[PDB]
Design a protein around this ligand. Structure first.
Ligand code: HEM
Ligand code: HEM
Lengths: 726, 726
């Protein structure tokens, strides 16, 4: 029952490209990657090699293949304590998944600021460019269960736990800069509406159903984040290629006591990139684990996800200077009005060891702040402060969830709290209360001050009556949707129109569709008309005369709201499919791989069967996957080298592979006789931008391909794809 | 007054076809469909129309849109108890999902036996053909989470709770007649191997990964159920079109105390029908809820799932008369050797009201037997008896899960058990122990007898030493795999080969694929060579010389092991896509739609946009979905009527619709100018079997199409689908 002779069961503990080795727990793949938090988990890491198999009480097991029975065909005996312990632990494996964001993928890394921020905040983790803060990040979808698919259309969660020297700070954000609703009291309404409908629990991972669009049509506050969801923001290529936002306005407090309003941003250093809808939806079927896999593999390859932290900063005296309320989380602050100041860089550089222990049990909370940070009255933030504490007690089984290893602070913690289910800490303090004399009052309160001080809330002025009332300043719902719409490129606008049209086609009750279209007519007539036409709906004269909402503080657009208007492409860590034949021209392949390797782009070698093929020069080429097994959905570009093209010329899967990649706007490159495939994608002989072609794969061919890949997708091909049957 | 004035928000309370009306809770869709269990749930059903919104304490709420704050832009106040109750209930909505079979879809129904089985069992529910037993049935996949996809390749669970007059009997079976392992002590091993891998929690809903095939390769007892899983059995078309089996040998006990060995069968009255792999995998992307949806809609349409319960019965004296052990759950009993005796009929005729409350909380247990039934020493069954009790106490929150409405017996239950979390029953008995005099010893024990007697175990002789030892009678692993293989049609054998080949290609460590292939060579050389060829592996001369395993009691095949070898087609409840154009020939459509209606086959009218088109004669045709919105994966056949074909002839989606349906072996029917689509699928001029074509949709056009549909798929097409890039 043993390992192969050749040690091929065990992956190399060295960075390797996706597919080259079986993936492995982080501490075994990258044992020399350390930080303070990863080190501190060492008390609970358990190995296995050379150890005897035992019960949980330490008793060695002789026979782990059989129950104890009276004779070998007899009844199982109740005294089999080994069987019952093993079955009981199995029987009790599951815990409640998260009520939202149950589907998520996490990794370890570190953060450091570029320069001390002491002028605007006394937060210790921002005080020194050479003081490094361990982090654990979990990225997530929102709607679906923990076993749902990665590449659904949904908002994404982006939660970062900072293990600072002055306490855990969790920054619990999303990949769009606003939320659907204004006041936390409506959260259960909204989430019930987007989640599977309660009679039949359908659909998973999708807003494309009646109840979501019903709530939307009756709650126009939702429309801004709905625009972002229906755009390609809702289908990121990778967690590495999306933006992050805290959404709410928070405060920074400096040593002088000055408060500055702040909104938090993460910039992906790999650039912004999203799938297209047909590709994203098909990919939930071909690989429901695509984003989880891609994140794990990037870290195993050395393509560490990196993000830049950035702050939009607004002085206290400028609180009311915009035509939107800063405390309204359905409103974004355009970068054109308030730029993002770069603050520091976060690098995710190691995977967990056990997904359940570290990812499933991690607990983040936006209420987890530190001195130098504070809240505001944002009525959605205010309610979140209550919710995460409450849900985690039942999800994680009691109030000692901070003792679960992943959640533990790395800085000191001491207090008079005691007991609770699964209490780990054995307190020796003779006192469990303060004030006490019997322990000289330790642990003691600490006055606030410039560093290492106790937490004190900023003394904000509160004046008003106890009311359940939405601020009048929050009652404007169309101008930000329209700013977003106007800031998208034409192809991005088309994909938005296609998102609304596809989703509303799945709404069974037609008046719900009509009411949503009426809401679109309040944002932009061109958008409303394009959706209406796809739905066979005709706008009335009144609808055509709805006056468009005002510009946002004179802005007619802000290109930072577009994924693509401003190029920010980075090809490192992207992947190319190379479609092999049984007599590959080894000169083509040499040049291809050399150029890819120079830019940090990975390759997957594909064929019509598994095993190996032999190139013209005797080189044996191992096959990663079949054309069916690793579809074009899972790669960024396709390259077909010369060789014996007749081997694959009439293979349906190989032809379809090119048709699918072509449809989904990916760069394709064809060398030598592979150019015969130009017929399948049915498109000229002078060639076309987006298809690289040459007698062979030279320097120039690869440079062209690599340039297209830096632009992510071939948008100019869009008019050509409605004709292809794929 | 948010409801539309025309009342179109509310589905009609009468049977309607899939897509015609919004779906609804069962008691609102079908209020007149009643049984004793459904009636008994009336005490906990809660309505809503005309009632005030309240807290859970009954306090009316005035403003469910806002939190209580100090000023309309101020902080939220801790005194907002309305907000806190609503968010707390929300925060605590989730419970742990089931450890296996977390993904499942359920319905209410009723069972009746065909005749009294008093001669072989004193079970009350089988005593009288006029005795109706309410049932609740849940069908499930096994590996994936509750939010994973339906049409994965997996075993399916088929669990039936019989609410009998002498106790709940749960028949907790699968859709194949054997299990992967022999002894319950290995269940955590096997389940851990198939489930997502522990470092990264990948893959969901798939056995296509290293750990599963590592375990299979080291445990040849698994091979028989592995053959079933790799066959089209692993991908059923519908829960309505798969077989059910209790797997284990149990006993029936009659009034005279005679024991008869029994294995339980469910026969689907709708026939056996499965998907093909590329279809199944893509459908997990296009509609991960396809089986759940299909079940619910069948019941809403009146296409009630019906199954015939059947027994294979073996006299006690015949225990040792087979080449295989009756207590070995990796062995099936061939129907050629022991026929299934028809026992009664089960009809599922009403959906749940609330999925969580009825489906998610339902608890089934194979240990829930009734007098007239008993267990055997099958060492897998023996361990199951321990596990379900134990898991349900954590899953459902305590020992009073039998008081959760869906789980309650409809017969009396009284005993001395008290307390426990969530105790609903208020016991008035002065006594909580027996024997007692202070309540005259009530409730009292009941002697066993012919009817209404207490449970007494059959007095089976036990003789042996206490051993953890597998019976040598269980040590044979290849003959049942071979009998299965040899019983499959040539196309089924091909789909088995492709299943192994596809799955093994995703195993990253090659030696593992090699080891599986070796195991295949012990089953059947043709099978092993064909998988080997697809994996680029050459068998050794030793491998080529392995002698096949013996026949199973002289049988070299049993056709009842095939899905298709014996026609059992049933078209009622199936569905056809009809591809519209903007001037449909209304005569073809009247004939098409009435032909389908007469046989109970549903239609979905499809186009390039939503809304309406107008037929040649002015008939308005309402559009159900777009070509991309409702892909050929979701239908059984496709019909293209004549009209203005030019409207859709260049539509890539409309052409691809036919390609996809063609590839997946579905019947396609083309009327008049729709025959121009023959070129998209490469159909010869003189036609081919599996494509119905005529000048018009009259005469025998619809009969021929319906004949194809009764045979499910056009298997003869398999060699043709190899070209076609789809
Ligand atoms: C700006 C709007 C919000 C954002 C950006 C957001 C973000 C997130 C994220 C990223 C997670 C997952 C953390 C993880 O990976 O474990 C999460 C979980 C959760 N959120 Fe929020 N959220 C928002 C609004 C709300 C509201 C209004 C409430 C309720 C008042 C709420 C309650 C919850 C709950 C109960 C969890 C599960 C936490 C756990 O089980 O540990 N969220 N949220
Ligand atoms: C012939 C073999 C088996 C069959 C046919 C089978 C069938 C099933 C089915 C259909 C379910 C889902 C019931 C539902 O819909 O809620 C289930 C659940 C479950 N099974 Fe089995 N099973 C088998 C073997 C085992 C074994 C050997 C064990 C452990 C010793 C086991 C432990 C469990 C557990 C813990 C659950 C979850 C039950 C709950 O949470 O209510 N099963 N089984």
């Amino acid at each position: 029952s043993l390992a192969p002779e050749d040690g091929s069961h065990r992956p190399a503990a060295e960075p390797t490209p996706p597919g080259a080795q079986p993936t492995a727990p982080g501490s075994l793949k990258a044992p020399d990657t350390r930080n303070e938090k990863l080190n501190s988990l060492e008390d609970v890491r358990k190995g296995s090699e050379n150890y005897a198999l035992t019960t949980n009480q330490g008793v060695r097991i002789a026979d782990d293949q059989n129950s104890l029975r009276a004779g070998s065909r007899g009844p199982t005996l109740l005294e089999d304590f080994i069987l019952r312990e093993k079955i009981t632990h199995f029987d009790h494996e599951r815990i409640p998944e998260r009520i939202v964001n149950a589907r998520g993928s996490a990794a370890h890394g570190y953060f450091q600021p570029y320069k001390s921020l002491s002028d605007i905040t006394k937060a210790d983790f921002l005080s020194d460019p050479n003081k490094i803060t361990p982090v654990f990040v979990r990225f997530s979808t929102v709607q679906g269960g923990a076993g749902s698919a990665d590449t659904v259309r949904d908002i994404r969660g982006f939660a970062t736990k900072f293990y600072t020297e002055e306490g855990i700070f969790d920054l619990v954000g999303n990949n769009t800069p606003i939320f659907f609703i204004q006041d936390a009291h409506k959260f259960p309404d909204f989430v019930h509406a987007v989640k599977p409908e309660p009679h039949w629990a359908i659909p998973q991972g999708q807003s494309a159903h009646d109840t979501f669009w019903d709530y939307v049509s009756l709650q126009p506050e939702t429309l801004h984040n709905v625009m972002w969801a229906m755009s390609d923001r809702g289908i990121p290529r990778s967690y590495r290629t999306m933006e992050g936002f805290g959404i709410h306005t928070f405060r920074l407090i400096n040593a002088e006591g000055k408060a500055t309003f702040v909104r938090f941003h993460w910039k992906p250093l790999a650039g912004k990139a999203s799938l297209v809808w047909d590709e994203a939806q098909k990919l939930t079927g071909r690989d429901p684990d695509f984003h989880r896999r891609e994140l794990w593999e990037a870290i195993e390859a050395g393509d560490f996800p990196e993000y830049e932290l950035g702050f939009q900063l607004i002085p206290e005296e400028d609180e009311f200077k915009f035509d939107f309320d800063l405390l309204d989380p359905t409103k974004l602050i355009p970068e054109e009005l308030v730029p993002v100041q770069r603050v520091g860089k976060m690098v995710l550089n190691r995977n967990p060891d056990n997904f359940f222990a570290e990812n499933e049990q991690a607990a983040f909370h936006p209420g987890h702040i530190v001195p130098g940070l504070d809240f505001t009255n944002d009525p959605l933030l205010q309610g979140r402060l209550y919710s995460y504490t409450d849900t985690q007690i039942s999800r994680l089984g009691g109030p000692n969830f901070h003792e679960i290893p992943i959640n533990r602070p790395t800085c000191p913690y001491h207090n008079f709290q005691r007991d609770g289910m699964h209490r780990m800490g054995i307190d020796t303090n003779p006192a469990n209360y303060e004030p006490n004399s019997i322990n000289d009052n330790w642990p003691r309160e600490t006055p606030p001050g410039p560093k290492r001080g106790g937490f004190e809330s900023y003394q904000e002025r509160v004046e008003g009556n106890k009311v359940r009332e939405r601020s009048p300043s929050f009652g404007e719902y169309y101008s930000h949707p329209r700013l977003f719409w106007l800031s998208q490129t034409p192809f991005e606008q088309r994909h938005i129109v296609d998102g609304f049209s596809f989703e509303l086609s799945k709404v069974v009750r037609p008046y719900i569709r009509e009411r949503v279209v009426d809401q679109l007519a309040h944002i932009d007539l061109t958008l409303a008309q394009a959706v209406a036409k796809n739905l066979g709906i005709e706008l009335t004269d009144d609808q055509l005369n709805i006056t468009p909402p005002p510009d946002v503080n004179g802005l007619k657009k802000d290109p930072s709201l577009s994924l693509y208007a401003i190029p920010d492409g980075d090809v490192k860590g992207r992947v190319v499919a190379i479609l092999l034949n049984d007599e590959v021209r080894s000169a083509d392949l040499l040049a291809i791989l050399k150029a890819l390797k120079a830019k940090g782009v990975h390759a997957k070698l594909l064929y019509s069967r598994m095993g190996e093929v032999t190139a013209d020069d005797g080189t044996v080429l191992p096959i990663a996957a079949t054309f069916a097994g690793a579809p074009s959905l899972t790669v960024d570009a396709v390259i077909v080298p010369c060789g014996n093209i007749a081997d694959i010329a009439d293979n349906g899967d190989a032809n379809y592979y090119l048709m699918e990649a072509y449809k989904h706007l990916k760069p394709i490159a064809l060398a030598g006789d592979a150019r015969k495939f130009k017929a399948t994608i049915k498109i000229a002989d002078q060639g076309e931008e987006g298809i690289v072609e040459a007698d062979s794969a030279d320097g120039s061919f690869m440079d062209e391909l690599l340039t297209l890949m830096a632009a992510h997708r071939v948008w100019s091909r869009i008019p050509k794809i409605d004709k292809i049957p794929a």
